[PDB]
Structure formats: C-alpha cells, structure tokens
From a paper:
In Vaccinia virus (VACV), copies of the double-jelly-roll protein D13 bind to the viral membrane via interaction with its partner protein A17 and assemble into a scaffold surrounding the viral membrane. The 62-kDa D13 protein exists as trimers both in vivo and in vitro, and structures of the recombinantly expressed D13 trimer have been determined by X-ray crystallography. D13 adopts a double-jelly-roll structure composed of 8 antiparallel β-strands.
Under the same conditions, the D13 protein with an N-terminal His6-tag and an extended linker (28 amino acid residues) assembled into spherical particles with an average diameter of approximately 340 nm, revealing a distinctive honeycomb-shaped pattern. These particles clearly resemble the size and shape of the authentic VACV IV scaffold described by deep-etch electron microscopy. To investigate whether the N-terminal tail α-helix is indeed responsible for this observation, we determined the structure of the His6-tagged D13 protein at 2.6 Å resolution by cryo-EM. As expected, the N-terminal tail helix feature was absent in the reconstructed map. 130,384, 173,354 and 156,813 particle images were used to reconstruct the maps shown in a, b, and c, respectively. Their structures reveal that the wild-type trimer has an intact N-terminal tail helix (colored purple), whereas the corresponding density is missing in His6-tagged protein and in the truncation mutant. Reduction of salt concentration to 150 mM leads to aggregation in case of wtD13, to spherical assemblies for His6-tagged D13, or to a mixture of tubular and spherical assemblies for D1318-548. The spherical particles in b were sometimes imaged as concentric shells containing several layers, or incompletely closed structures.
Author numbering:
A (entry chain B), B (entry chain A), C (entry chain C): 16 to 45, 49 to 547
The structure:
C-alpha cells in the first residue's frame, strides 16, 4: 500500500518577485460626463491586480435635507475600461461591477455605507454643514483577482490605461426641494485616485489565459423581450428587470437612510404617513385639500372606511380638542365607481399619546398592512391623468418633505427587489428552447452556488475550476443558426387600480463571453469563436 | 534554482459537458404519511447533484392565531432516500439533513424564514386570510455536492428514484386553540417539485468513489445510554439529546415568532406574563382562581414575596383605582412546606404608565431574572400531579392564548439548546474507552472546525481532504470485539422543585459510515468492512 | 484533444493515522504574574495542532457594579510560548494572538461574549451574586493550523512545553468604586486547562517546513517613530497605535457592556449625561458644584449657550416645579477667554416626560452631536492641570457611577479604533524608502485581502499559497545596510482645546519573520538569513 503523505509537503520555491502598493492620480475630462484616465507605464511592473478607486467627497453646506445613497462609491461609477495599445482588454458597466461585488460585505462597507454618509441630514442655515468631507474606496473586482498572482494582468512591456466614467452627481444624492442642488451640481467635481498591487517579477514565464467579459443588453421600455447577438462562447447568462422612472419627477414620500431592511423602509413610510393620518385638533383640521375626508373618531374609537374599521385611541387629548382620522390620505382608481386603492384602509389600530408641550401625537403601537411596494410608489403616480381621484390629500408641510431619489442600480419595481414580476422565463439558443421555467428556481440556484443573498435569474454553463481549466461554455452552431440568445418573459399581472401597475419596466440581459488573452506583441484579447 | 511558476498556469481542457436545470413533478401517496416519488430516467443525463425541493404552501383562512415554524421547508421533511435498481444509494433523516444545513444561512433563508411566514398572525373572521400562498425551497445537501462535478452522482444508464417522506402538518404549524386545526389538517396536502442540476457528458470516464451515509440511533426515554452496532468504518460520531414532550399537550405560554434570539424568547415570555402580573383595578381584581394571591402595592411601591422584594411603580393611575401585584402567578413545588418555584419572585422592578383610553398598563422598564428555560417549560408541567400547588393562576384570557408547538428538531431542554444537560460523556469502541470528557470540549472543536454556531458533541476521525483521498475512519477489530460504539452520559442534576426537571429526554447518537460506490452494472454501494 | 477528467478522481490512500482530543491540566506559578505550564510527552503522539485553553471563571459575590470585558478569554492572555528541548519553537503576545483571531467570530464567541458575562451587573448586598461561575475557551491559533495535518507540529520524540502567561485580573474586569476589588484580586486565581488534537501516525515521513513568527516593537510614549532591527526575511509588516492611559486613573463615564456598536457606545454615554443635563426640580437644583450654570428653560423651550440653542420640552411637569438645563456639564479649555469644549452645546433637542411616581424624567427623542471620541475621554482628562475651568460639574451621584476600564487591546484613541490618527506613514528598509502613503490605502488592502473588518495598516510581501510554497519575503542586504525596518508617522492634528489631544500614544510595529523548522535531533527552528 503506497500511501500519500498527508503530514508533510515538498515546498516549491516560487518565482522571485516583490509586491508593491501603487497609487496614481488621474487626468479628468468632461452633458459633460466626467472621465478619469490613469496611465500605467513602468518597466519594472510586470503584473498587477486588485484595483481600488479613491474618491474624496467634499464638505456639503447649506439648507435642506441631503444624504448620499448607500454604496455611493459604487453608484457613482458609470463604466470602467482597461486598455492597452491593441485595444480594450476588459471593461464593465457600473451596474454589473456592483452586481459582481454585491456579496463582498467588506467592499460594500468601504465604498460608503454608514450613518454619517447615508442619514438624511438637515441643514438649518446657509452656513450649516450638512456633511463633512470624507473618502470612499471602490474595489474594482476584475477577472485578474480570482487566483492572486496566477490570474494577474501581465504588462508585456506595454502601457496600460484605466478609464473611469462617472455618473452625474444627481445619481448619488438623496435630497429634498429645499436643498440648492443647482449650485451643488455646478460646484461638485469628482477627485479620483487609482491604486493597485504591482508585482516586480524576475524572469517571468508567461502563458496565454482566458478571460470572461460581461456584455449587457437592455430591452425597450415595457417590452418583454431582449436579445443578445453574436454569442459563440458564453459561460453564463443572467436576466433581471429595472424600473424606468423617466415618466416621473423621481420624488418619493420617504427613504429610510442608513437603515436598509424592508422593515426599515416600511417604518420610515408609516412614520411619514402618521403625521397627516391622525390629527388632534380644535375643530375640523385645516390646511388640507378639499378632496380630503377628515372624520372625528367616535367614543368607541372605531372609524369605518367602506368595509375597513380603523381603531384609533390617543391618550391625553385636551378637553377642547378631538381626534380626527384621514380616511383618504392617498387614493387611486381608474374607474369612477369601482375599486379604489386607499392608503388609509391599510391601517387597523393606531394608539399613542398627545404631548401638550410639543403639541404633537407621539405614536406607540401601530397595526397596519403597508408593504414594500407602497414605500416604492413614486409621488407622480398618485396624481397621474389615469387617476380619477385627487390622489395626494396630504398637507403642504408633508408634501414639502418628499425626496428626490435617482439611484441607478434599482432592480424590480421596489427598492428591495423583493417582488418578482417575472412569472415565466424562456431562453432560446437560435430557434430551439434552451431553458424554460415558471418559478425562480434559477435564482435559487444562483444564490445557492454563489453564496449570495441578492441573486438574479441566471443560467450558468460553467462548473469547472476558474483558471486552472479552460471554462466550459455553451458553444455556437452558426450552421444551425445557434449564434444568438433570445429571452422572452411573462410579467406578473398586477391590479389595474394599483399605482405600481404603471411603473415602467426594462428587461436586462447580461452575457459573459469567453476571450483568449495572448501576450505576444503586448497584451491583446481575441473573442473565442 | 528551479522555481515553480506562480504567475501562469497551463490550462487543462476539461471533459466536454453541458449543464441543465431540470424540474420534476412527483407522485404523491399516503396515519397516512405523505410520500413523494420522483423518477429520473434520461439517457442523456450522465450525472447530477444539487437537489432542491419546492413546496407550495396554500392560503390559510379562518379565525385564530396561526404561524409556521422557522425553516418550515426543512421541518416538514421526515426522510429522503435516493435509490437505483440495486437498492438505496444514500438516505438521511430530516433532523440530520437540517443539521448538515444548519450552517448554510442562504439555504435556511430559502426554506422559509421571514416575518410573513413566521409571525403568529391573527384571523378575526372565518373569511379572514391569515397567510397567503407561498413557495419554499429546500436544498437537500448530498455528498455529491462537495466538489461539484468531481463528486456528482453518475447514472450508469440506470433509473434513479428520489423518495421524500413528509412529517404531519401539525409539526410545522404553531397555533392556538381558536384555530380550526382539524379542518386545516383534513385539507392540507403537500405539493412538491424536485429540481437538480444535470450534466450531459461526452465520453465520461468513471471511477469508483467513497460516500459517507449517516446512521441514527435514539435511546429509550430518560436512559443515559445508546449504542450503535455494526460499526466497521466510521468517519465521525455525534451525540446530543432531544426533549420528549409526549407526556404533555405540547402547549407553551409564548413563542417569539420570527425573532429567534434568546433575548427575543425571553421578551415574548415576559410580555405574556405582565398582563396578569400587574393589574390596575377598582378593588381586588376579579377573574382569577381562588389560589391566586393578589396584593395591593403600598405607597413605597415595594411588595415582599418571601425574601423577594418587587418594586412596582405605575404612572397615571386613576383616583378610584389601585395597583395590584400577582405574587404567585406560576408556582411549583413537590413538598408541601419546602422550596417553591415562583415566577413572580423573578421580577425586581416593574414600571409603566396606565392608559385611560385603552384601559391597559403600557410597561416601560422591567428588571427580571427570567431565562430561556422558563420560556421552554410546557404548560402541562405547571399542573402535573407532582405539583402540590395549583400551578397556573393566570386569567382565562391569557390561558386562551397558549400555543401548540410540535417542532420536531428541538435539541436539549430549551428552544435554543442553550443549557447543556450532559455533564460527562464516555464513548467505548468495543469494551475499551475511546473517549471521555466532562466539559463540552468536543462541541467547541466541532464548532471551530466546521465554522458553525450550533455544533454538537462530535468525535471526528477524518481530517483528510474530502474526495481526493479515501477518508480516514476508525476501523473495527471484530476479533477483539471492537465492532460497536457505546455511548454513556451523566445528565446535569436539576433541582427537584423546578418544573424542567420533569421534561423527558432521549439520547441521540449519529454515526457516519463509509461506503464504496461502484458503477459496474448500474450504481451500487457496498459497506466498507 | 486529451481532456482532463473533471467527473472522477483517483483517490489517494493517505497516511494511516488516528486523531484524538487530549486535555491537560497545568502547573501554576506566580507583582507575581500567573504562569501555567503544560507538558506534552507521549510516544504515540506524533503531531498536534488546534490548541484551546479552558478557563474557569469563579462566582463573583458582593456589592457594586461588576462586569467582564468582551472576549475576556483572549484579554487575560499576556504571552504564549511553545518550546522543546532545543528552545522556543513559536511564541506570540496576547495582543497579536487576539489580532490574528479578530476575524474568527466563532472563536471570539467562545472566548466569552454574552450578556451574562459582559453586562455590568449590580450587587446590592454583600451576599448577592453578581456573576455565576462560567467557562470560556480560547482558541490559540498557531501556524500549525492552516493546512490541517500538512502543517501540524511533529514531535520528533521530543517533549513539548506550552507556557501561558496571564494578565492581571484588573485587565479583564470593568468595575465601579463600590466593588471590593482588593478582596476580589486577593482571591482570584486562574484555573486553566489545555486541549489539542493529537495524531497517532503510523510510519510518518517528515520533511522540513517554514514558519512565520510575529515580533513586536513598541515605541516610546508620544514618539512618532519605531524601528525593528535584524530583519532578514519578513513576510509582512503592520503598524498601529495604542493609547497610554498611565497618566490617568483609568476611569470613564460609561461603558455599553455587551452592546459593542459605535451607536451603542454613544447611547450609553448620552444616557449617563441626561440625568444631570436636564433637571425637573422645585427651585434651583441643589447638589451641584459652584461652577455649575443651571438655567431655567423659558416658555419657548429654547436655551442659548453662546451661539448654541438647546430645545428642551418635558411633558407632565408639576405646577410647583420647573425644567432646568445644565449649560456647562463638562467643560474644557486651555486659555481663559478663548475656545471652550462644552458637552452641553452638543445637544440640540431634548424631549421627554416627567414621571410623578418615580420622580424622574423619562427621555424620548434626543438630537445631539456626541461621537465616539467623547465616550472615549478619560475622566481624569476633564480635570487636568491644563484645564483652566472646573471640568466636571456633574452631581456626586453620577460621579459615583464611573467605571474603571483597563482593557489591554485598545487601538487608536477611542474604544472602536474609529478615528485614524495617522495622517502619513513612511517605511524604510535600510535608508531607502520602501513605502509611503497619506491615506489608509494599506489598511483598505489588508481588510480586502484578509476579509476582515478590523484591519490595520499592513505591508504584505507574500502572495503565494501558504504551506505548499516557500513564503515570499522582503530579503535583507547587509552589504547595502538593508537589515532593519524603520517606521515614521505624522499624527493627525487635534485641537488644543479638545481633551482627546492629551491622550498619550504609542506606536506599535509588528514584523513576521520567516523561520525554517527542521526535525533532526528533535524539533528546532532557525532564523532565515
């Protein structure tokens, strides 16, 4: 019995090298999209990987409510490209980069995720500081990071250029109307610095490698189809939907800030609704539109709103004041005398205590049925032409606290991507059906295999180890016409009298193509056919 | 100096294959245990792994309090078996499957763990919907998943059958007496679908492999011994205890629902006790049994309960009402005039405010010594024959809110498996002592080595990589009689006047046997001797 | 096309061995530092790894406030050494051991991290039990654990000695002045037990290996320099700063106990300040020093404190009482009529309700600007000679609740190591500059590469797999004088009128040297040159 020794190893002497952390400042150029270019030319840098982008956010002064989106560093990136003299080596969109890093909690934390950055801070005077200057770090994960020095990008005596395109500053900022965003936008400038790990290698022996480069296709607005052409060697395919808020002003009622659970979203929304829902006043409350229906709460504390009973009990109400309930705070309906969507009927029990000192109701326990979709409705959709009612019956004070939100990486139709609006998915390679499903079993598989919490519907064709094998791909057959991937979905049917029915959707299809990387005459890549 | 190249690899071309996600519907057969069978016969399916079971839970309508246990998908599974024409290939119990997946947070989340499923929802009218229809996904982790395609189950032109046995629906449901469980049970049916990843391989070269199959032995009620016979090649051995609630009605006072921390359990329990503990009333409170001792709280706010001082201060008590304290809410004792277990004496400070509108006391800060064992006591044990007192002096209203809980995967004597009731463990291989310990150092080691939070006392005999080596086992010596593993424990001594002393216990011993998998004449396994 | 089989393996038969868990009691010897020695001499133990130290903490009785620091098991360890007959094989400081385990959440949990151990418990009578006896487990991670049996420490027929030096018990205890620490210290004794996994190997074939041993250098108080000499083969270098609280009594105002988030620290601090900040009294509040400035809150609820407006609104104040605000609770300043640091001016809105029953103010919402540095100020620094004011104007009651905290593993100048006090870092190998940076990009890299949340500024020179290659090092050139590593930093500039400016700092430099491990004539190590 010849036995393999599992208590000792014969240590290999590795290639002689020395690593170094290297920072570079960029050249910035500019609706004038901001672009940073970083030039890497150094004869003693043989390979590199682990790119990190530094961004200095400035001091924010003035009046209004201002905050940064979570993961602001990732969300300010529109596009990243690595090139040489022979053309582009590897590139990615900001959405797909953020997708690839969504499971790296450390990287997400470094890119800007804290109370200081992401709470909605309030400025009271034109000289009040709303945010202090800060620095975020964006880990640009590339295929050259999977196996450390084995997968690194070798600079075969070539000059490597890294180009970063930035999103407009309105994408990364949550603000109210009181904040002077025009001035802020005129003054804001991205200040980037690029870091990487370089390797000074002694007598490097270079071999050709393989690289996967994502390619992204967005369908037209509300179409259930998208197609990616010229597919010859794909390792994976993923499909998801994005909301198109272009038909709105991008104003929402609430945003939970640094708290990012579904419960947190719902709590912020309910908190914003309670100030206009239950009113303690001397006589009929004033300052609400004519369409508002404010009723007094009887001695039994129960108000009926057409099949719905709301239980209101407030402590310490003065003897000259009564408790009032808003029975149609937000209303939606497409036909005049049919079903109505009423945000007031989603409450069952409201208790609290009136404060004589601050003249407010401090709410204690609330029983309600608000979900994430309601927190995700845009304010424009409550008052669209299709609504036969006056949708928004809130006070002017609460109307003034709505927030502009322009986050570019939102999936689905809600902030959490919690509702699945795809009820059937079909993929075709050429004309034949490659995959079909009704439930999200492919998303279950993507999450199980990548150990992620925010998976998408994904067909993965590669199950081999990463760089020590050539990746397994679905291969084209141009003779039989199998050279394109077509995706058709069936959207989940929503009620025509729910405002979320009118959020516009786009289908996104991402394809990972296989490329050969060769190192004769500098660095170059060729698409595998 | 010959140096190993650590900056380049020679990529191997792997076996030509194509993966595919495959779903199957089953054949259901039926105290009529429900059994689902899934048949896999497909000539182009060469291998498979990554089994996922889909379960559609129906709409739940009616009155009462209803909820699902956490991880309902895992808890509805009694047994899973994979077979071919030559017999069983691999099988497992539901408890051990859940044990093997306890460290996979993604899988646990997919099997049904959310507020919507696990809050105890309340139905008010016979047409109220308590739960909406939902789908859960149970990842059935098999030994064929450890190394992706290397460890996959090859179908040597054989038909593979997957059989799932389900637990009764009462195991996965938390309910009160007001819910119509008889009708619910008559109507509930499991609707399962089986998914796996199949591989269509071109010219597969098959080699024999090794597989570990768990074998489970449960000792008799309250015996400190269990033995597993016919042990010839075990890779690991684990020991834990389970509570036997068969001598009870399985009713408990509280359950925290979706919150699953120890603090959450304790908070739910204290919340259920406070409504009968402190009473604001006009005169001596009514509606309590004769054995209740309700005393008025003096001006200093301190009530003495035999060496115990409770500090009660309630704000806003009306002038016609007084504050009362329940001094023997739950009581236990075995001898008439000796030590008594009194749930009231476990409180030291109770403060709150009376609400005139809702006629309740809203409690603020509470100081207490309630632990997890108290939340884990069954209501039947408070009123057993051995209790010389009337144990339960609660109001009928609170008595009506007790929950039936029949969770099948509970370990220890509390819901969290927090108390260790094993004070000494001894394992014998044959007649010789193989292992001995007093503290839980083997559980510490199991958690450290498996990177788990819910480890058990485990002897692992294998420290070699998984599939690239033959596993290391403890080998039998039938000549010397070393062919069985005997386990004897010494239980921690509990006080005879604590009700948890009378919870019945079973010892569970799990043994992982090594099997050879061969592929001539289809798939077959043979026990290593 | 020769294809590598990725669906089958040729299983290797490994070395024949049998593992066993082994516990040992020690020999304890003793300002009399406690030292435990464990002797391992057993002919059938061929290798070992995975050391775990058991510690029994006793019952704590008496009066006062008492608690254990988080991770008490790690914090009681001063030094660990593994030796043979040829000298020390491997050793480490307690700080660096805890650093190496900071990312192992399971190990941190096992070493003592729970509400029961880490809440500040209160003893009321001299016989009250503050803490029950408990056992913690400290995983002593060694280089012999990285690759299981491949990296294990082989005992070439040698006797191995493990020696543990313990910190004084005052390092692991958080206490007030009311606790009798002199008696506690006279009675406390460490009771340790050592566990490891031993391997009984049949015909072991031993080969020489490599090991990295940390070496630690602490700079002098407040010097921005430190140097590690005799550096010939280092795999990594890390730099951080520690606070020196020797010029204080180590008393702080608050400690959050088991809650260990920055928000938790701030909340505990604000809670301790509110009792003296806002006072509901009949007339000017009494019991405060003469330097206190207590003003009555006007009808509009706004008090001005030199450019700062505090909004105070308390409900249910009796008609004979008024609301008062402490305008200089904690004050600091170095010049008589210049800038002042006033803890009262860091509040903007204070609301709450007075309780007539308990005669206290129960605070509801608070708006403030307290940060982690304020919670990290020592009480001695408020009343130093450099303060031209009476710094601490709190009541005697709150002064009596300050806690002694002597935690030995604190980094930076705050409890969370959140503020970076290093604005520039330079490393020199010999006289040449090896590395330079202004921001913490090296800490970003350390966290990204080690997947940690508490990284330090680190230069790592090794990117090769751990034990199957010889590690890559930065190599000395004694001819050119490159045989020492010098570190110089520039500290962040703090305001001279902030008390945190006067916390003393030490620079810590840790170097990982490469050693050869050989097994002829027992175990021995030699420093690589």
């Amino acid at each position: 019995i010849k036995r393999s020794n599992v208590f000792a190893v014969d240590s290999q002497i590795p290639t002689l090298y020395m690593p170094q952390y290297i920072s570079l400042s960029g050249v910035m150029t500019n609706d004038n999209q901001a672009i940073a270019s970083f030039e890497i030319r150094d004869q003693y840098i043989t390979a590199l990987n682990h790119l990190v982008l530094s961004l200095e956010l400035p001091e924010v002064k003035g009046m209004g409510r201002f905050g940064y989106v979570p993961y602001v560093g990732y969300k300010c990136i529109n596009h990243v490209s690595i090139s040489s003299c022979n053309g582009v080596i590897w590139e990615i969109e900001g959405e797909e980069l953020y997708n690839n890093c969504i499971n790296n909690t450390i990287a997400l934390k470094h890119s800007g995720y804290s109370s200081e950055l992401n709470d909605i801070s309030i400025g009271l005077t034109p000289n009040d500081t709303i945010k202090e200057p800060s620095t975020v770090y964006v880990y640009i994960k590339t295929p050259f990071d999977v196996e450390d020095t084995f997968s690194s990008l070798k600079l075969s005596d070539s000059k490597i250029t890294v180009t970063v395109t930035f999103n407009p500053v309105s994408d990364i900022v949550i603000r109210d109307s009181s904040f002077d965003f025009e001035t802020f936008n005129k003054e804001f400038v991205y200040v980037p610095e690029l870091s990487f790990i370089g390797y000074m290698v002694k007598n490097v022996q270079i071999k050709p490698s393989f690289i996967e480069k994502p390619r992204r296709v967005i369908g037209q607005i509300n179409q259930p189809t998208a197609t990616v052409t010229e597919v010859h060697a794909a390792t994976s395919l993923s499909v998801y939907t994005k909301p198109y808020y272009g038909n709105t002003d991008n104003k929402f009622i609430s945003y939970p800030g640094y708290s990012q659970d579904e419960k947190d979203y719902i709590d912020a929304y309910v908190s914003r609704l309670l100030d206009d829902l239950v009113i303690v006043s001397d006589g009929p409350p004033t300052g609400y539109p004519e369409s508002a229906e404010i009723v007094e709460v009887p001695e039994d504390g129960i108000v009926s709103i057409q099949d719905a009973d709301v239980y209101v009990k407030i402590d310490n109400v003065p003897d000259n004041m009564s408790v009032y309930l808003h029975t149609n705070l937000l209303m939606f309906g497409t036909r005049k005398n049919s079903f109505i969507y009423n945000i007031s009927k989603k409450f069952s029990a409201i208790t609290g205590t009136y404060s004589d000192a601050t003249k407010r109701t401090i709410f204690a326990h609330i029983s309600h049925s608000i979900n994430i979709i309601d927190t995700s409705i845009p304010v424009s959709l409550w008052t669209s032409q299709r609504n036969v009612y006056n949708g928004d019956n809130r006070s002017a004070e609460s109307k003034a606290k709505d927030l502009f939100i322009n986050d570019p990486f939102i999936k689905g139709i809600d902030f959490k991507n919690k509702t699945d609006i795809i009820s059937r998915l079909e993929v075709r390679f050429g004309n034949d059906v490659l995959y079909s499903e009704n439930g999200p079993i492919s998303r279950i598989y993507n999450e199980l295999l990548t150990k992620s919490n925010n998976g998408t519907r994904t067909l993965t064709f590669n199950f081999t180890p990463k760089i020590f094998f050539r990746p397994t791909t679905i291969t084209a057959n141009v003779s039989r016409g199998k050279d394109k991937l077509s995706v058709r979905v069936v959207y989940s049917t929503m009620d025509v009298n729910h405002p979320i029915y009118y959020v516009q959707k786009q289908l996104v299809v991402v394809c990972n193509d296989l490329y050969k990387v060769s190192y004769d005459q500098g660095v170059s890549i060729t698409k595998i056919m």
